[PDB]
Design a protein around this ligand. Structure first.
Ligand SMILES: CCCCCCCCCCCCCCCCCCCC(=O)O[C@H](COC(=O)CCCCCCCCCCCCCC)COP(=O)(O)OCCN
Ligand SMILES: CCCCCCCCCCCCCCCCCCCC(=O)O[C@H](COC(=O)CCCCCCCCCCCCCC)COP(=O)(O)OCCN
Ligand SMILES: CCCCCCCCCCCCCCCCCCCC(=O)O[C@H](COC(=O)CCCCCCCCCCCCCC)COP(=O)(O)OCCN
Ligand SMILES: CCCCCCCCCCCCCCCCCCCC(=O)O[C@H](COC(=O)CCCCCCCCCCCCCC)COP(=O)(O)OCCN
Ligand code: HEM
Ligand SMILES: CCCCCCCCCCCCO[C@@H]1O[C@H](CO)[C@@H](O[C@H]2O[C@H](CO)[C@@H](O)[C@H](O)[C@H]2O)[C@H](O)[C@H]1O
Ligand SMILES: CCCCCCCCCCCCO[C@@H]1O[C@H](CO)[C@@H](O[C@H]2O[C@H](CO)[C@@H](O)[C@H](O)[C@H]2O)[C@H](O)[C@H]1O
Length: 589
């Protein structure tokens, strides 16, 4: 005897993914080390090395993600993540969106999109001092994700019915990694002492990151109204408005970046806003719609904010700059009030607060958005071209045009604000196209105008739906109450339908002539979760309107109903569509 008998360890998805996250951690660790030596002692052979490791770090990250997709497709049940997330396992589209379903797979997809964005920024045309430092901080973020994926929270150990629970996560993860690369440049810029050049080289990641943020927030609104179906587009609970804080700051930052992009002004506020917006997007992406991983993310957040504002610490009035800076102050003040209100029950040792703070601040940004671009750059005082009458005229028109109907001073003043805003969009377009010719060539101005108008339409829609909504909860056998809000319904039974994993039950209703005839709102005894009854609502859109139909409890042989009535919520989503087809127009169609 005495001749050894070797075996392989057979190549699982498990050890492919383990070599994936470990090899990615190794590549990103030595990328952070070679980038830091490249800044400190100034040698070119280390800025070559950190730029050499961007492609292998992303490749090992892709190996780990494709190992998780591999395991989810081959129906290996030995790993903990797949055995706990193939308790919703069968269809093809949900097996490909299970690799970010719970926590560990989602931080794998998060670190993957980080590595992809670092790869796409690694071919930078950037001078080597802050090239070494952007690689240092971006490899640090990758090292945090794969460290927090490797020592804690590993995917490779041993629920619903809608697709937006797939695509609302990635929309923010993309958004975060977009706001990664300006922040990197900023923490580079304040250390490389070149304070203006950083934001005009990084501008498209800032716009695209904010576009992914705005599509995420509007998509979460639509999904919470129509598919999660608790009769509302917005929640002020500490999970939901925590994805409202980053979107606010990434908006203020977008406007300040544009100012210095065109003027070299507020580089101080730009550094502040990209640091605050980036760490905000971190803590918003960690705590979206869903132990000791929270401590690691809290330490990472503290590190990010402390680093950016520490390096900023070591380093006109009535104009378009003043209007944009006051608007960015309004955005930052709004995020400040939402954070200061969220922790105001925490730090002592509701929805009326947030609504009553949001309506004046929303009125202020909807006013400033109209008045700002109609101002010239760096003016002393508003004495010459006071065009502000006709805007005020439109403003005044809308208020009386609403006040001479039912509309309360909130709703009628919001009508005045939208009419003032469409007036400003026309005044901007008229004073733009008068140069004579295709104004559509100037993609920033015309796409921004479409985007500005789209928010204008949402301010009207939100104030009209917030003011004018009625809910009624009834219980009908073949009727108890029939007319609510313009159409009379009646009860016609329950059906049972089996489509799968969930059994569905029905309330079939009836309406006359052009009232929506025979509708069918839904309910699930959904077997997978602790036998709960969640609803999915049915809703007719109308020419002025949206009508939401709810089940509440379907009882044993008689059932209940809820019907809520809101105005202009469909026009809120046509405004969301207008924002999508405008921010795409800032890019190339
Ligand atoms: C010019 C600017 C350039 C700057 C670029 C540099 C960037 C560097 C990268 C930044 C990363 C920041 C990471 C800070 C987070 C640390 C937070 C610690 C978390 C923690 O202690 O968790 C506890 C222990 O868990 C545990 O059991 C241990 C968990 C440890 C997780 C750590 C994850 C590793 C992340 C990699 C960090 C980077 C390393 C540096 C190369 C909780 O549990 P408990 O004990 O309280 O339970 C209670 C029972 N009593
Ligand atoms: C319903 C599902 C929802 C899924 C949403 C998917 C989003 C659609 C993606 C469309 C684009 C995909 C194909 C185009 C490939 C383009 C890659 C290069 C992009 C690029 O070069 O842009 C740089 C910026 O990068 C950037 O700003 C970031 C580029 C990243 C593109 C978006 C990545 C999406 C990844 C999602 C994968 C899952 C989809 C699988 C079906 C330019 O910068 P610059 O240097 O020129 O600026 C200089 C300033 N002076
Ligand atoms: C699946 C759901 C996703 C919905 C998206 C709907 C539209 C899908 C297709 C988008 C195609 C847009 C054009 C893609 C071109 C990719 C090729 C790269 C070309 C390139 O590098 O040019 C850049 C354009 O930005 C870019 O690279 C554009 C990247 C494309 C992603 C942009 C979408 C994010 C914003 C819209 C939000 C809606 C998302 C809804 C989920 C920079 O320009 P430059 O070099 O000329 O700069 C200097 C001037 N000074
Ligand atoms: C200088 C030369 C002289 C010119 C003259 C100067 C005149 C200045 C005029 C400017 C005055 C600004 C006044 C703004 C008041 C807010 C009106 C809208 C409020 C509203 O929505 O209706 C409320 C009820 O809505 C509700 O119950 C829930 C509302 C939820 C908040 C609404 C969110 C709106 C956000 C809009 C989004 C904008 C786009 C964001 C990107 C009314 O109820 P109330 O009377 O009880 O209120 C009392 C709070 N103290
Ligand atoms: C605080 C009030 C606001 C003011 C004064 C304002 C002003 C401006 C200005 C001057 C521009 C440059 C193009 C132009 O001159 O039209 C611009 C661009 C833009 N704005 Fe606004 N804005 C405001 C609020 C908002 C809001 C609420 C949104 C969100 C819908 C928004 C989204 C955008 C976008 C996406 C661009 C294009 C930026 C680019 O990629 O170049 N702004 N804004
Ligand atoms: C482009 C992005 C811009 C986004 C702008 C949005 C900022 C302002 C947010 C306004 C919306 C807040 O609206 C919020 O809606 C929810 C859900 O409908 C309301 O919640 C409501 O739901 C229940 C449902 O039973 C009702 O019985 C109850 O009377 C009421 O509280 C909140 O009380 C209100 O605060
Ligand atoms: C010198 C003053 C200058 C300001 C000019 C104001 C113009 C005058 C506008 C008054 C017209 C509004 O008239 C009003 O209309 C509708 C029609 O049913 C009803 O509507 C009323 O209901 C609600 C009840 O909460 C009020 O909040 C609302 O503001 C009001 O419009 C009132 O019964 C009637 O008083």
């Amino acid at each position: 005897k005495g001749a050894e008998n070797l075996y392989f360890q057979s190549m699982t998805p498990a050890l492919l993914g383990n070599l994936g996250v470990s090899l990615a951690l190794a590549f990103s660790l030595l990328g952070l080390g070679l980038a830091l030596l490249a800044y400190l002692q100034g040698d070119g052979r280390f800025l070559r090395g950190a730029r050499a490791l961007v492609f292998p770090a992303f490749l090992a990250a892709l190996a780990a993600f494709l190992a998780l997709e591999w395991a989810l497709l081959v129906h290996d049940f030995s790993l903990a993540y797949v055995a706990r997330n193939h308790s919703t396992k069968d269809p093809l589209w949900v097996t490909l969106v299970t690799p970010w379903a719970a926590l560990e797979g989602s931080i794998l997809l998060w670190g993957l999109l980080q590595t992809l964005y670092t790869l796409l920024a690694s071919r930078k045309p950037l001078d080597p001092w802050r090239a070494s430092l952007v690689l240092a901080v971006l490899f640090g973020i990758q090292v945090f994700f794969f460290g927090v994926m490797a020592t804690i929270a590993s995917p490779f150990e041993t629920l619903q019915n809608h697709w937006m629970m797939a695509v609302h996560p990635v929309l923010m993860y993309l958004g975060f990694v977009g706001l990664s690369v300006p922040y990197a440049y900023a923490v580079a810029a304040m250390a490389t002492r070149r304070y203006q050049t950083w934001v005009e080289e990084t501008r498209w990641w800032t716009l695209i990151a904010w576009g992914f943020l705005t599509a995420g927030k509007v998509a979460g609104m639509w999904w919470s109204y129509e598919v999660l179906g608790w009769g509302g587009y917005w929640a002020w609970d500490p999970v939901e408005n925590a994805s409202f804080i980053p979107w606010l700051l990434a908006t203020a930052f977008l406007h300040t970046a544009f100012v210095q992009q065109t003027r070299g002004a507020f580089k101080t506020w730009n550094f502040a806003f990209v640091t605050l917006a980036f760490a905000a997007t971190l803590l918003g992406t960690f705590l979206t719609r869903s132990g000791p991983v929270g401590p690691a993310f809290l330490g990472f957040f503290l590190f990010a904010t402390g680093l950016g504002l520490g390096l900023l610490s070591r380093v006109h009035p009535l104009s378009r700059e003043g209007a944009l800076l006051l608007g960015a102050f309004f955005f930052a003040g709004w995020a400040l009030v939402v954070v200061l209100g969220t922790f105001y029950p925490l730090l002592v040792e509701g929805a009326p607060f947030f609504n009553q703070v949001s309506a004046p601040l929303g009125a202020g940004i909807l006013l400033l958005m109209g008045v700002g671009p109609l101002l010239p750059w760096r003016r002393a005082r508003g004495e010459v071209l006071r065009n502000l009458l006709v805007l005020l005229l439109a403003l005044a028109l809308g208020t009386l045009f609403g006040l001479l109907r039912g509309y309360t001073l909130g709703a009628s003043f919001a009508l005045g604000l939208f009419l003032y805003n469409a007036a400003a969009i026309y005044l901007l377009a008229r004073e733009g196209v008068l140069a004579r010719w295709g104004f559509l060539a100037n993609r920033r101005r015309v796409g921004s105008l479409v985007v500005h108008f789209a928010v204008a339409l949402m301010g009207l829609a939100i104030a009209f739906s917030q003011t004018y909504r009625l809910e009624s909860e009834k219980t009908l056998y073949r009727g108890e109450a029939w007319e609510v809000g313009g159409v009379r319904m009646t009860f016609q039974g329950v059906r049972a339908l089996d489509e799968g994993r969930r059994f569905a039950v029905e309330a079939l209703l009836k309406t006359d002539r052009f009232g929506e005839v025979r509708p069918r709102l839904h309910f699930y005894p959904q077997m997978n979760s602790p036998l709960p009854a969640p609803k999915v609502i049915y809703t007719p859109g109308n020419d002025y309107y949206f009508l939401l139909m709810d089940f509440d409890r379907e009882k044993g042989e008689w059932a209940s109903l809820r019907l809520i009535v809101t105005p202009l919520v469909f026009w809120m989503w046509v405004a969301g569509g207008l924002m999508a087809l405008g921010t795409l127009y800032i890019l190339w169609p």
